[PDB]
Swiss-Prot record:
The gene is ampD. It is an enzyme of class 3 (hydrolase). Its cofactor is Zn(2+). One of its GO terms (biological process) is peptidoglycan turnover. Zn(2+) is required for amidase activity. The active site is at residue 116. Changing residue 63 to F: 6-fold decrease in activity. Its EC number is 3.5.1.28. This is 1,6-anhydro-N-acetylmuramyl-L-alanine amidase AmpD. It catalyses: Hydrolyzes the link between N-acetylmuramoyl residues and L-amino acid residues in certain cell-wall glycopeptides. Residues 30-167 form the N-acetylmuramoyl-L-alanine amidase domain. Amidase activity is inhibited by metal chelators such as EDTA, dipicolinic acid or 1,10-phenanthroline. It comes from Citrobacter freundii.
Length: 187
């Protein structure tokens, strides 16, 4: 994949206005697949911008209203129109999940330099996302090799048929395109 100034190339730079710090240490290389929307990169929905400005009202549900108090920071957010946004480079650890576990490894927090996908009410995801994500993932695997067999989300803690409250990211398409437990070297 292209890299420019040691930053991820062909992406929109949106470095989060307040990063996190979590007291955990596991090698950062986990791919997180789920449809979320939290940061106001580009949209016209006032709820997302209200979070960052701070005027969010405890109406939607408790989790979102709760976590508002804590700043958020993702890593690479791919929007539903096949766009790549980058919030928080490989320098100064982020937080965007709560908890997740895969292959007898639980991550207490989203303490890994993965990806996150963004959409709004399952608005057309543009298959292009999967293709471009797979390209980024090829680079990321070649950087830190884990992701090649470590793809999960927040509901994929055990059953891969669910990945969040809205998967539909075609596990057969993605797993075939990405490293299929072959076309790898070293480990
Ligand atoms: Zn999630």
């Amino acid at each position: 994949m292209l890299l420019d100034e040691g930053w991820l190339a062909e992406a929109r730079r949106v470095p989060s206005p307040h990063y996190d710090c979590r007291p955990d240490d596991e090698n950062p290389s986990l791919l997180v697949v789920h449809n979320i929307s939290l940061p106001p990169g580009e949209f016209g929905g006032p709820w997302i911008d209200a979070l960052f400005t701070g005027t969010i009202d405890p109406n939607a549900h408790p989790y979102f209203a709760g976590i508002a108090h804590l700043r958020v920071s993702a890593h690479c957010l791919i929007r539903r129109d096949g766009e790549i946004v980058q919030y928080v480079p490989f320098d100064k650890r982020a937080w965007h999940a709560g908890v997740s576990s895969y292959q007898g490894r639980e991550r207490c927090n989203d303490f890994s330099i993965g990806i996150e996908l963004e959409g709004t009410d399952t608005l057309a995801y543009t298959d292009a996302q999967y293709q471009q994500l797979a390209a980024v993932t090829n680079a990321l695997i070649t950087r830190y090799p884990a992701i090649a067999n470590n793809m999960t989300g927040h509901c994929n803690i055990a059953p891969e048929r669910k990945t969040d409250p809205g998967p539909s990211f075609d596990w057969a398409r993605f797993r075939a395109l990405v490293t299929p437990s072959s076309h790898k070297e070293m480990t």
